[PDB]
Write a protein that binds this ligand. Structure first.
Ligand SMILES: OC[C@H]1O[C@H](O)[C@@H](O)[C@@H](O)[C@@H]1O
Ligand SMILES: OC[C@H]1O[C@H](O)[C@@H](O)[C@@H](O)[C@@H]1O
Ligand SMILES: OC[C@H]1O[C@H](O)[C@@H](O)[C@@H](O)[C@@H]1O
Lengths: 92, 54, 303, 249, 302, 248, 302, 248
């Protein structure tokens, strides 16, 4: 209910109109998605390679709902592991 | 014999088997506890990303 | 037209102190973000459809250190005023500017506020609290709150006035090298912390792999009447060289594991956790399973 | 309790403030040096409360919650252990380390469980706040955020009253009644659940060119003469030299 | 036909008998035919073509024993495509085998015989110093499973690839593997020379100093009836840093360790390397080393 | 006597298996860690062989046969050291290191000439195999190969039974007749002779580019809390990092 | 003429005595003329030019004693060429001397006084803890070998170099050698700073903490008698993890070492770096550090 | 007395050699690890001199003169401390670090002022050499260089020879009169003063590219089983690998 719809969104995005700067990121995401790889790593790579392309001005309007879905509640990090190292790391 | 229960910044909590009560033994001084907290926190921040891998 | 004057920004800083409180395991620190933005959002455009779109816009995921969120709120105010009156910034630059400096700022704020300033202030407060003096809680409160309020105001104002001078820097380079160095250091100290902070000692009372018996002259023999000086000297020398205790030599599983390589059990448990996570298994299930496994291993006396 | 019902309401107020600052985490009303001292101000002996706060502060270092990983909740420890002091009219500074501090740590773990439960609870309130946000009501969002804050404050306020009405020895009997097997198993399982966090941060960072650094760090750790700072210095130096060589090539 | 996967597994299992018929005119020739028997029998049993195929596999077959799965795979693929498809004569397979046996042997030798075998034997026989019971079973698990990991996966890779990449071998990947194996082997060999080359120079003689420790510099043991605060003080000084009886005897080995641990082992290794560079046989060097050890013990130096 | 009546019978079988392996040199049964342990498991004290196997393996390093040479052939040495250990009930771990492991070197020396003599016998077997090769019998070469295998393997089975039948006083006095300056001298030599194989392997792989790695390994090794597996991990990661940086 | 090599060997064997006539107004001048005496004796004795040479070679000249061999070589070449060929006036010899009087003294003083001398002395003293005879022997052997090799090779290189290559030095190989030596020196300097800068802060006072232990966390010593299984139990407790007398005195140095060993030494090294950068004579800092140590002992906090 | 009657003339000989070696700094006869060893080996107890020299050299690091800044002149320090050692038989290794090393530092300061006076005295000798240079005599420069040599070298032989005449009671009471606080502080300062030389070296050689190697060496030093030569080998290997990788 997550990977399939993410694939559909990426497929719809990569054909309408895409600039060359994020073409590499989208292609890398698709290549790591069809390959059986960890979803959070794909999400992090897709989200991190778009921050300059988003904040400055551009974030091409075609890939707007894609960034919205990647920055949603489920796809975020919550820093569970880093927190466990930081907080519970020396507890026991 | 003392069984380990939990570890804090200054000292650890044990259970005494000769008696039947949990006993806290303090091992770190205020300077030592503070320094250990600084080092542990910075190394736990370094263990994961410093924010660049979240 | 609105300029977001000093008094409303001061109220925003004061109300940013409630950033936590609507703490969620679904969207962390959303209610506090919206609550702190409430004054400026009401000033710019209240009681409209755009007000609802703005409330849904600011009630999204936000996970940062609360102290370093005054730069975020200031840059957000600077972007929002010029979005309402000036430019046509869509609902993609605000979220992007939030996410871009939500992560690194949290990762730099956690070790400096929770693990650098708070330990120092607390240790100083506790060092002079050994006499029951009232000055210790007063010192802690005053120092901590002065530093925190000064930070929350200075950085808020700096983030507001600059606005674009940090967005341009975030849009540039020099971040790839920092990220790669952070990854390298992360793996190095990650392996170190896996070896050091994880202890799965398998001694137990039972679960012994070798209980061979020793022989006369192969261990330290003890008297029963008088340990004396000379035979005490011989016993101490025997213990010093390598000689073992009572003849029944006991070797545990942890002994063999440590002769293979120290910290191997932690590494294997970590690798199994990586495999399970890659196999789409929620970490809460693994946490509960590890807890019950530890309980059983303590009851089974293998640990 | 030296004074009348005034101290009864003052301890409840102090507990409520500690419960609020447990999540606010700014004014540090949940820190033992503040909470214990405030509870000692309002009920007679201030010096005993300040001594308890100073002793518990060293334990409370490193009790900071980071990134959806809750800490052992020094608020409940500082409130409840100090109240146990108040009920048991002895402050010899040996009774502290004998009974109050271990009780403080156990109640800290209990408060960690309780605050995790209330953090799960607050999600429904925030969902209702978002539902009201669509209606365009700023007041609804503000009031639901305040309700969540109030619930978290009551999470510590209610145990204060319950522990005030409960006999002093019952708490110690209940604390010592749990089998040592359960506590030891919990400790040894907690010493392994952190591997889950290690695994997730590895999976969120792993790359084929940086695994060698992971294994070099793993194999260079058993040296005991290397402190944590020395090993971090090694990691930073390795990163800098590797990046220098990568750039120069 | 088509070399069903169960037949591939049988060939993999029986390929472990590649050696055994070691010769001088045709070294290690019987085992290759033995491992090729199943495919030859399946494709054409009891025929003159089977006889000429046996004759075409009887020539020089001298490769490293462990790296033979790619050879078997390429041979099987060639036979499969020639017995039903093309008409490759018994000249191309001989050429490719001769061309890719030399370099393949020369990469297999320094990554298997002298890179992983000595280090695996060393880790098996180092923890075995204290009479460890696990070491034999550990060696069984770590070495015999290495063939299941390598000789099968490489066999499948070579069978899938056919003869497409056999000509491209040595195009840059084999040199990298050689360099990495050499680096790892040099590192571990230096470690082994430091650790497991015992030139302990303690001896009854060969004492460089015999200074007597004075009062307070050694543990003072009372005249019997050791009791409270006495045993306490003695354990305190013993644990802190203090030494036993006031004679301080240090040997040449102590000074050598203070310069560099395992210095004499490194010197001996360098000397025997120089001697072996002069085409001096290993056995006479072994005998000379035993003799020098004998006379060192006779001199009460070693 | 020992653990069981069948222990002696199984000792002969395990000795025959060890002898077959010692010339096969594939299953490593002939190595001390395996040869001692297998017989000790059945011959009473199971852990006695493991201690002896571990103590003898560290000396039996680099005892290979290279280029038509005769190795000390630990197949006989380990078996003789273990059987003498079980016959004489003394496991002080100083007896093993003083009169058993040093005696294993002399037993390996004897096994060298023993296996040379049994090796010279196989010449006639291979000669008659060549003679029967042209007879057209495929099974002939197989049966004569197995006959040579059995003849070469019985050279370990026979002395095992001889030591089992011989009286303990005879072997005890033979062991006591060994001068101990000789025993300690070739014990030192056996500790030494690893350098020959080390020099061989170093000579095979040595470049002006990889010598620094050798010296770094030599310098980093005195850290006692680094087991050899940790050292192997060190070498692998160093090599990977170096190759990654060079190929850039 | 032609400066036969035995003359150069004698020149170095007397340049061993470069100092001895040390002065303040005219530093290190007599030794230089004495070292160059044989060359002038061979070239032009007993003349007006001879006394003019003695007078122009007895002027101010200050450099590190070991890094002066290139100066000897270039001066020898210049004087012999001027006596045989060209008519170089008394302006290029002094010019070539002064041109590298500064940089050579600045590069050879910390390299030879505070880089190799401390490491050699530290090794020799570390292997002299037991009174071993080989410590002064090792020190003398290694120091003399390094000094003689450096001096001879540098003077030979300077003479072969002349006045041209001695100025065009620094092409390709010299930069790589400099960078590698700098890397090695920084590593060894870090090791030295951590190891042999002792700021032990134990003190009778400055006891940061004196927290008490509790029953079951320290070894209990029977005051009456310890004979029997009591000694074995005490030894087991001591060997497992248990501690001595129930008072844990935590000194400041203990917490500093908990942070990192040799931290105060690193801080003092940085402070001395800053002081030296502020143009302060080293002897002033030495006296100040002695006074600081005296004051630290006065407070009993050392 | 001591080892022999010739021990006295060997004391004066080694003191003269230390005097010549003090400013020349070629053979390091003036160094404590050489001076103390030579002066103790001749004066009876051989290992005591080596122990004292090894203890004193570790605080005598960074004691070299740089550009008219006269060094603490370990030449007199080592001779005086060791001769005081052999005068009063106390080699407890607590006397060594309690009442000898600070006395060595005080005698080092005394030697510094003495060598400053002799250094100023040599100016007139060098002026006489310049006056004799115009006479055309090549031997005049040699003679007025050797005269300065022997005049400066006598500054160690004279006090060492005079000390053997002074009765031990006077030197003993003078040593006892020094407060222990001063001695302990001098020892601490001596352990401190090597940071000056280390800082000078770091200041000469420092770059944004080589600091990480300094920090790596600093953080790998607490490993006590890595000797100084091992760390030097590690540094050489790291430098070589860095250069090979950068040049690629
Ligand atoms: O770092 C992220 C941030 O998120 C959590 O919710 C808070 O408890 C903070 O303490 C933490 O620092
Ligand atoms: O590679 C050549 C090959 O020759 C023979 O078959 C055997 O000695 C093998 O061990 C070796 O690998
Ligand atoms: O470099 C300056 C130089 O000045 C003088 O010649 C002597 O003190 C030398 O030891 C010193 O090195």
């Amino acid at each position: 209910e997550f990977e399939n719809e993410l694939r559909s969104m990426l497929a719809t995005a990569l054909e309408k109109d895409i600039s060359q700067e994020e073409r590499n990121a989208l292609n890398i995401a698709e290549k790591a998605l069809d390959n059986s790889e960890y979803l959070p790593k794909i999400i992090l790579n897709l989200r991190k390679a778009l921050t300059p392309l988003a904040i400055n001005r551009t974030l091409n309007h075609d890939l707007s709902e894609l960034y919205k879905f990647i920055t949603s509640s489920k796809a975020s990090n919550k820093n569970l592991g880093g927190g466990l190292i930081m907080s519970w790391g020396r507890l026991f | 014999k003392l069984t380990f229960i939990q570890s804090t910044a200054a000292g650890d909590l044990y259970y005494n088997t000769n008696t039947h009560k949990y006993v806290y033994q303090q091992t770190q001084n205020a300077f030592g506890a503070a320094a250990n907290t600084i080092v542990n926190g910075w190394m736990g921040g370094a263990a994961g990303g410093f924010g660049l891998h979240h | 037209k609105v300029t977001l004057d000093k008094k409303i920004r001061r109220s925003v800083m004061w109300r940013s102190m409630f950033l936590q409180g609507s703490w969620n395991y679904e969207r962390m620190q959303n209610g506090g973000w919206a609550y702190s933005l409430i004054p400026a959002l009401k000033k710019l455009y209240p009681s409209g459809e755009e007000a609802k779109e703005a409330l849904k816009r600011h009630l999204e995921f936000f996970n940062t250190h609360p102290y370093v969120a005054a730069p975020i709120i200031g840059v957000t105010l600077a972007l929002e005023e010029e979005r309402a009156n000036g430019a046509d910034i869509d609902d993609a630059a605000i979220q992007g500017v939030k996410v871009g400096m939500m992560g690194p700022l949290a990762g730099i704020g956690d070790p400096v506020f929770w693990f650098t300033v708070r330990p120092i202030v607390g240790a100083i407060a506790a060092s002079l609290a050994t006499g029951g003096s009232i000055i210790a809680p007063l010192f802690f409160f005053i120092v901590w709150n002065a530093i925190r309020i000064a930070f929350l105001w200075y950085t808020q104002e700096f983030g507001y006035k600059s606005g674009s001078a940090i967005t341009k820097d975030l849009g540039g380079g020099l971040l790839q090298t920092v990220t790669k160095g952070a990854s390298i250091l992360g793996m190095f100290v990650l392996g170190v912390l896996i070896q050091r902070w994880v202890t799965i000692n398998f001694n137990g009372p039972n679960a012994v792999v070798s209980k061979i018996p020793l022989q006369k002259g192969a261990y330290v023999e003890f008297p029963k009447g008088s340990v004396s000086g000379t035979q005490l000297h011989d016993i101490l020398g025997q213990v010093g060289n390598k000689l073992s205790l009572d003849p029944t030599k006991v070797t545990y599983l942890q002994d063999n594991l440590n002769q293979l390589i120290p910290g191997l059990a932690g590494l294997l448990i970590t690798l199994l956790c990586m495999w399970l996570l890659k196999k789409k298994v929620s970490p809460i299930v693994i946490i509960f399973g590890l807890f019950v496994v530890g309980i059983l291993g303590r009851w089974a006396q293998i640990m | 309790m030296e004074y009348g019902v005034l101290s009864v309401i003052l301890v409840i107020v102090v507990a409520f403030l500690a419960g609020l600052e447990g999540i606010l985490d700014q004014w540090q009303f949940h820190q033992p040096i503040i909470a214990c001292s405030l509870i000692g101000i309002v009920t007679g002996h201030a010096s005993a409360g300040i001594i308890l706060g100073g002793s518990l502060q060293l334990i409370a270092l490193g009790w900071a919650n980071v990134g959806a990983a809750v800490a052992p909740d020094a608020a409940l420890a500082s409130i409840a252990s100090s109240i146990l002091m108040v009920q048991s009219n002895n402050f010899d500074l040996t009774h502290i380390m004998g009974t109050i501090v271990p009780a403080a740590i156990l109640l800290a773990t209990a408060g960690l469980v309780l605050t995790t439960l209330v953090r799960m609870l607050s999600v429904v309130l925030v969902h209702q706040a978002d539902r009201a946000a669509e209606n365009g009501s700023y007041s609804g969002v503000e009031m639901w955020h305040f309700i969540a804050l109030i619930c978290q404050g009551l999470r510590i306020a209610i145990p204060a009253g319950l522990l005030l009405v409960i006999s002093p020895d019952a708490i110690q009997k209940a604390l010592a009644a749990i089998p040592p097997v359960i506590s030891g198993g919990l400790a040894v399982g907690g010493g392994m659940v952190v591997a889950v966090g290690y695994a997730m941060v590895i999976n969120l960072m792993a790359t084929r060119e940086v695994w060698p650094f992971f294994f070099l760090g793993f194999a260079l750790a058993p040296i005991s003469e290397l402190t944590l700072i020395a090993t971090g210095v090694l990691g930073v130096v390795i990163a800098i030299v590797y990046l220098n060589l990568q750039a120069s090539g």
